[PDB]
Amino acid sequence: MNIFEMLRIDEGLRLKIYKDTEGYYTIGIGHLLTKSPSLNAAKSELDKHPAIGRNTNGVITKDEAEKLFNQDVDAAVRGILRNAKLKPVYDSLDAVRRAALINMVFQMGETGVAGFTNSLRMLQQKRWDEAAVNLAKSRWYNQTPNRAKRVITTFRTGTWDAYK
């Protein structure tokens, strides 16, 4: 396991336009196409992404999916490295826990995760179970419980147990 395999589990692989946890048009492996309510709007965006740049009509191959996936993951890592509150945290975690942090940014963006103040602090001080206890009481946790549980278990143990 690693970040890719982990996110593929959390996000699933959908070759056709779908709606996310929030009601937004996404495709593949969690690739948000557009916050607009229009499926046409969505198809448009899709047809225009450089990795695709063709006429899909809401349908992509398994390759294009992974290609967007790769980019999205990199984008996540960038957001982290470019965020002042996040970077310090990342630098301080091990290879497995780093995957947990990337998962949160991938899911919710750099800005959202940056606002997990108390939890980031506990993570920086290596207080696993407290970090865990603390994350479990967020709205993120109530919103996507299944996912959140595995991520938290990841921070807590520093093992892939929750995904195995």
Curated annotation (Swiss-Prot):
It is found in: Host cytoplasm. GO terms for molecular function: lysozyme activity. Changing residue 11 to A/F/H/M/N: Complete loss of enzymatic activity. The active site is at residues 11, 20. It holds the Pfam family Phage_lysozyme. Gene3D superfamilies: 1.10.530.40. One of its GO terms (cellular component) is host cell cytoplasm. Induction: Expressed late in the viral replication. InterPro entries: Endolysin_T4_type, Glyco_hydro_24, Lysozyme-like_dom_sf, Lysozyme_dom_sf, Phage_lysozyme-like, T4-type_lysozyme. Optimum pH is 7.3. Changing residue 20 to A/N/S/T: Complete loss of enzymatic activity. It catalyses: Hydrolysis of (1->4)-beta-linkages between N-acetylmuramic acid and N-acetyl-D-glucosamine residues in a peptidoglycan and between N-acetyl-D-glucosamine residues in chitodextrins. Keywords: Antimicrobial, Bacteriolytic enzyme, Cytolysis, Glycosidase, Host cell lysis by virus, Host cytoplasm, Hydrolase, Viral release from host cell. Changing residue 11 to N: Loss of 84% of enzymatic activity. Its EC number is 3.2.1.17. GO terms for biological process: cell wall macromolecule catabolic process; defense response to bacterium; peptidoglycan catabolic process; viral release from host cell by cytolysis. Substrate binds at residues 32, 106, 119, 134. Changing residue 119 to F: 10-fold decrease in enzymatic activity. Belongs to the glycosyl hydrolase 24 family. Endolysin with lysozyme activity that degrades host peptidoglycans and participates with the holin and spanin proteins in the sequential events which lead to the programmed host cell lysis releasing the mature viral particles. Once the holin has permeabilized the host cell membrane, the endolysin can reach the periplasm and break down the peptidoglycan layer. This is Endolysin. It comes from Enterobacteria phage T4 (Bacteriophage T4). The gene is E.
